């Protein structure tokens, strides 16, 4: 190997060439203090906190920027390293405001903590401090710029990960101000993450502001459900109430970021909530009732159904436990009409093979691709951290990105081939100039958006995209372990609903409209009472009254994603489980508990009592749904592509337009975001 030997405090360690002093100290388990270094941002070297003594060298080096030379003895605890740390901490705390009681960073402040650990205990600054004008960069990030220590993680994040280039430093010297220089509103899809990386309380969360304090919060590790990325989060609660949502580090998903809907839609989780069971009275109005009466009135109608008399629509926020619960409940009635709101085309292979509805490459495998083709999607808003991973590969691997669709902003530059779907017939024939690019690329990656599959020619689009992927993989320089065909989902419930064998889309209910309809959280408005017969018995089961609940006959108040231990499968097939952060409010219950109690009232009691037994059933239907943080590889692209060649569906003349063109359309997609006042302020802030 080419590993060089260096020394940290006399201890030998073998490091790769190019490894910094800080990373060599990290490999022996020592963390150097830092303010401007961030391992997912570019090296700046402008806070000077990481200055460390290399011995036999009469000058400290910035450990975040200096590469190790062979034979260096890094002295992380020597006298002049500690003197450097105390001097730099003294200059950081000279003009810093005495705001620690009224600052939201107190208790979780880097500046506080490593002033306690590495700086002195007292002041010599006998002067008046500076004070900086605050900025209005939007309704999400409160900005108090006197607390700024000018570490420029703002600017590097907005430039390199968010791809915005609208933050910067104006002025010079001690009057150097981080800002936008103008009244500009920093509303990216990843705009709240600067609250994370700001080491001080200069950038705080405006919705979290003043309400809590970090030591008293309980940290429940959980999963995002706002899209099909499956971002690992920390729901921090305090005395039975959700305070905020932080990211967890997962290197293969969301590296340590989350989106703004994920970070700030939790205030919709305490508005418009379903807390008690409701039934229709003699006036046809919803009135509160008990669980006995509501489950009896649902089960009395369920016993009178058989076959296609009962159907069910799954919403976008339903865990795998409630999905297999309602599947077994309708299979006791011998009903196979179980649908989702999001249309996936059943033509050809359908949902039989997993490979034709997954992000088969991975979220991580974007780092290994060299050409990414995006069809019919706006991945900036449909899956914002998938787009952030594409931008990271764009920036570091010189990734070539092409897009077939409307020319949206993706925060990086791509090749816009056009919006008509017939380009998919031109790349699959070789007449188009991008087809040679796909032939000469070693790791191509073709990502079809699941929002483009909502069109009436979704089978034709999926057939064309699969034809392109198999024209590449069976002929060009693909190894065989590399996956080319990919589908990006936008719905947390969708992949788990397809692994359990639902029929995607509501065309099976439009075929024969039943006299009884379950709505597990169905709020897309896909099926309204004009599609049903004269007195259909609609049962809404969910946690918000948004769309499906005003038309329901019996309302079953359910649990939300922070309120249940619950399996969700992301767009790449990785199964993940939330944990209970708080309990559901009022008389609301966990969702499969409701379906199982309904089964016991109906006399068709499902063979599970506990959550582990539901997960045993869930393993029986497909065993990948219980192997958590694991991406099971799905083979058999060739058989799905052979089945797709059977029925030639025609491509429509409509251009591929994603349903989310601007930041306006991002903030409200599901029932939690539509109930969110913070998301309403985001929409009103971007529409003005």
């Amino acid at each position: 190997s080419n590993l060089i030997e260096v020394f940290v405090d006399g201890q030998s360690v073998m490091v790769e060439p190019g490894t910094t002093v800080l990373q060599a100290c990290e490999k022996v388990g020592m963390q150097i203090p830092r303010f401007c270094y961030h391992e997912r941002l570019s090296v700046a070297g402008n806070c000077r906190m990481c200055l460390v003594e290399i011995e036999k060298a009469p000058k400290v080096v910035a450990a975040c920027a200096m590469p190790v030379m062979k034979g260096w003895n890094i002295l992380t605890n020597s006298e002049k390293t500690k003197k450097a740390r105390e001097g730099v901490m003294e200059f950081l705390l000279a003009n810093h405001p005495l705001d620690c009681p009224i600052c939201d960073q107190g208790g979780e402040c880097d500046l506080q903590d490593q002033s306690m650990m590495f700086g002195s205990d007292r002041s010599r600054f006998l002067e008046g401090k500076r004070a900086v004008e605050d900025k209005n960069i939007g309704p999400l990030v409160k900005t108090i710029m006197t607390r700024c220590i000018q570490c420029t993680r703002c600017i590097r994040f907005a430039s390199e990960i968010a791809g915005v280039d609208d933050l910067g430093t104006t002025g010079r010297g001690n009057d150097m101000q981080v800002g936008t220089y103008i009244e500009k509103m920093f509303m990216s899809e990843l705009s709240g993450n600067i609250i994370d990386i700001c080491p001080v309380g200069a950038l705080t969360s405006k919705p979290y502001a003043f309400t809590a304090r970090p030591w008293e919060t309980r940290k429940t590790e959980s999963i995002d459900v706002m899209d099909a990325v499956g971002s690992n989060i920390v729901v921090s609660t305090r005395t039975g109430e959700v305070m905020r949502i932080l990211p967890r580090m997962h290197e293969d998903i969301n590296e340590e970021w989350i989106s703004d809907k994920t970070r700030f839609a939790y205030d919709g989780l305490k508005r418009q909530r379903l807390t008690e069971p409701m039934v229709r009275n003699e006036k046809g109005l919803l009135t509160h009732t008990t669980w006995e009466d509501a489950l009896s009135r649902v089960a009395g109608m369920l016993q009178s159904c058989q076959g296609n008399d009962v159907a069910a629509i799954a919403g976008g926020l339903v865990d795998a436990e409630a999905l297999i619960a309602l599947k077994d409940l309708l299979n006791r009635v011998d009903s196979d009409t179980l649908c989702t709101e999001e249309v996936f085309p059943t033509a050809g292979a359908g949902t039989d093979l997993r490979s034709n509805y997954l992000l088969n490459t991975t979220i991580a495998g974007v780092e290994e691709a060299d050409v990414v083709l995006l069809v019919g999607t706006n991945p900036r808003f449909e899956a914002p951290l998938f787009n952030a991973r594409i931008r990271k590969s764009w920036l570091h691997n010189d990734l070539k990105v092409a897009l077939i669709g409307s020319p949206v902003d993706l925060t990086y530059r791509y090749d816009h081939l056009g919006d008509s779907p017939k380009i998919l017939q031109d790349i699959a024939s070789g007449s188009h100039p991008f087809s040679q690019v796909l032939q000469e690329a070693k790791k191509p990656m073709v990502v079809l958006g699941s929002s483009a599959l909502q069109r009436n020619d979704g089978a034709a689009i999926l057939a064309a995209v699969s034809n392109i992927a198999q024209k590449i993989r069976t002929s060009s320089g693909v190894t065989g372990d590399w996956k080319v065909m990919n589908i990006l989902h936008r719905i947390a419930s969708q992949v788990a609903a397809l692994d359990l064998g639902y029929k995607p889309g509501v065309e099976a209910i439009r075929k024969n409209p039943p006299k009884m309809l379950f709505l597990l959280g169905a709020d897309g408005g896909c099926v309204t009472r004009q599609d049903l017969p004269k007195d259909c018995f609609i049962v809404y089961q969910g946690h918000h009254g948004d769309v499906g609940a005003p038309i329901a006959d019996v309302i079953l108040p359910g649990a939300a994603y922070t309120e249940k231990s619950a399996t969700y499968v992301n767009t790449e097939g990785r199964a993940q489980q939330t944990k209970v952060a708080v309990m559901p409010p009022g008389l609301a219950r966990e969702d499969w508990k409701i379906i199982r109690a309904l089964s016991e009232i109906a006399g068709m009691t499902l063979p599970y009592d506990t959550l582990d037994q539901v997960r045993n059933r869930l393993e029986e239907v497909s065993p990948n749904l219980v192997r958590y943080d694991d991406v099971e590889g799905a083979n058999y692209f060739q058989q799905a592509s052979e089945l797709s060649k059977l029925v030639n569906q025609q491509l429509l003349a409509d251009p591929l337009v994603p349903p989310q063109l601007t930041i306006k359309d991002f903030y409200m997609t599901d029932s939690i975001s539509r109930a969110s006042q913070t998301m309403a302020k985001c929409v009103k802030a971007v529409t003005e």
Binding site: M583, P584, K593, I594, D609
Partner: protein, 114 residues
């Protein structure tokens, strides 16, 4: 897997000690009903003794049942020597505690506990 024993080298000596502790409790129940002037019968107290012995009846480790016999002897010494009051004897009879929901449906009705 070579462990130091407490009293019993195997499970048969352990069952001997369990049996002698049960004999001592069985003899003690009428005196306990009398001098603590309880409201239960002697048969009901012997039922509670049998219930508490059958509660631990699945243990296969000699050291664990040696500690169970030691703790039963300690509770017996606290009962014979009148160190417990009436309340400590009556804590085996969870009488003021309302009966918990046992099936799925009533636990669904009352709350969130599995």
């Amino acid at each position: 897997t070579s462990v130091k024993p407490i009293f019993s080298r195997d499970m048969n000596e352990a069952k001997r000690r369990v049996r002698e502790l049960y004999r001592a409790w069985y003899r003690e129940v009428p005196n306990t009903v009398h001098l603590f002037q309880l409201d239960i019968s002697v048969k009901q107290g012997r039922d509670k003794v049998r219930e508490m012995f059958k509660k631990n009846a699945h243990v296969t480790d000699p050291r664990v049942v040696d500690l169970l016999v030691i703790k039963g002897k300690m509770e017996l010494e606290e009962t014979i020597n009148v160190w417990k009051q009436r309340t400590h004897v009556m804590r085996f009879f969870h009488e003021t505690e309302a009966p918990r929901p046992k099936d799925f449906l009533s636990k669904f009705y009352v709350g969130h506990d599995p």
